[PDB]
Amino acid sequence: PSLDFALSLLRRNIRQVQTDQGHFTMLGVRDHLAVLPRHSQPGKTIWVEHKLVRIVDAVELVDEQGVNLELTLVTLDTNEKFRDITRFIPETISPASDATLVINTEHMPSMFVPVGDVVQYGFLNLSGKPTHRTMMYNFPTKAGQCGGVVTAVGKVIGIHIGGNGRQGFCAALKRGYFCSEQ
Ligand SMILES: *[C@](O)(C(N)=O)[C@H](C[C@@H]1CCNC1=O)NC(=O)[C@@H]1[C@@H]2[C@H](CN1C(=O)[C@@H](NC(=O)NC(C)(C)C)C(C)(C)C)C2(C)C
Ligand code: NA
């Protein structure tokens, strides 16, 4: 049952964080590497579970032509490594059924939100930035769900970034994002 996978991910890979931009869900992917929504704009340090943590390095991810993907990769000065979940990230972006959004912020503590089908949306204007590889679910997402992890059928497929009051939008994850070979 999928709540099993979602729980595992919540406890081993998902952290509450705070930046100067607000409260977000962060996904640790492997080693000291984590992913956030670009608009969290992490600086030199970040609150992770109410402890101050140094960011060694941060990169705003782009597609081949330099278009925004609305994701930032951070290298954290943490003591222990995240369980490697890269094998749960698909190589290519595909639609999925029966997805759950796994969220954990001060505004939205540990919650599992069934969002249904997640499908490729593509081009989005995000606060005036052209953005590629977005996906959509027919769920009215709200304040404090950003960084929320989209999971379906043992797969980690997106990071929640926005909503229009009716639908919710995530930045797709691909395995190649955590790997220099792809
Ligand atoms: C997120 O930052 C958070 N902290 O929860 C938030 C999630 C939104 C808020 C209400 N419902 C949600 O799912 N994301 C944002 O506020 C993003 C952020 C800025 C605008 N934005 C939006 O979601 C806006 N709508 C929007 O961009 N709609 C699309 C184009 C995605 C259909 C808005 C009007 C503030 C809710 C940026 C950088 C995209
Ligand atoms: Na969140």
Author numbering: 2 to 183
Authors' text:
The main protease (Mpro) of the betacoronavirus SARS-CoV-2 is an attractive target for the development of treatments for COVID-19. Starting from crystal structures of the Mpro in complexes with the Hepatitis C virus NS3/4A protease inhibitors boceprevir and telaprevir, we optimized the potency of the alpha-ketoamide boceprevir against the Mpro by replacing its P1 cyclobutyl moiety by a γ-lactam as a glutamine surrogate. In line with our original goal of identifying broad-spectrum inhibitors that target the main protease of coronaviruses and the 3C protease of enteroviruses, we also assessed the inhibitory potency of MG-78 against the Mpro of the alphacoronavirus HCoV NL63 and the 3Cpros of enterovirus A71 (EV-A71) and Coxsackievirus B3 (CVB3). Finally, coronavirus Mpros feature a catalytic dyad comprising a Cys…His pair, whereas enterovirus 3Cpros have a catalytic triad consisting of Cys…His…Glu(Asp).
